[PDB]
Amino acid sequence: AMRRVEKVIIVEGRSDKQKVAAVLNEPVVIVCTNGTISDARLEELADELEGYDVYLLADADEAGEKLRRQFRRMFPEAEHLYIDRAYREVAAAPIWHLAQVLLRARFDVRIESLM
Ligand SMILES: [Mg+2]
């Protein structure tokens, strides 16, 4: 019946998480960093997610970029996903745009999220 969950999306904020969750049509673990995250916790997270298909979806702003920088150093296995700079933040991006970003990265998305 059910297949194992192997995809993980990492986001910065709780609202980002709720929004990403709303668009998905398959089970995905969504990890929220709640702003900044320590190197230790990140190494620990990277270790735990060994063998998972991991993605980082951050805002188009300095704080989002700081997170990306940390991940490129501490967690190079994580694949970076981007929203259009015209929307700036994941929170401000329309649901359909989020859905397309995820769809392009081979996530199952709800058809309803495109309308
Ligand atoms: Mg931001």
3-state secondary structure of 84: coil
Are 12 and 64 within 8 A, CB to CB?
A: yes
Query: Tokens for 43?
Result: 């190494």
109 Cα to the center of ligand 1, angstroms: 24
Residue range of the domain that includes 76: 1-115
3 Cα to the center of ligand 1, angstroms: 34
For the chain, what is the domain count? 1
Angle at 34 between CA 75 and CA 67, to 5 degrees: 35
Q: What is the resolution of this structure in A?
A: 1.6
Residue 97 CB neighbour total at 10 angstroms: 18
Q: What is the CATH number of the domain that holds 68?
A: 3.40.1360.10
CB proximity list for 102: less than 8 A, separation 6 or greater: 9, 20, 23, 24, 81, 109
78: enclosing H helix or E strand:
none
CB proximity list for 80: less than 8 A, separation 6 or greater: 55, 56, 57, 58, 68, 71
State residue 17 phi and psi, 5-degree precision. -65, -50
What is the distance between the terminal CA atoms of the chain, rounded to a whole angstrom? Answer: 29
60 Cα to the center of ligand 1, angstroms: 7
2 Cα to the center of ligand 1, angstroms: 35
Angle at 31 between CA 100 and CA 51, to 5 degrees: 85
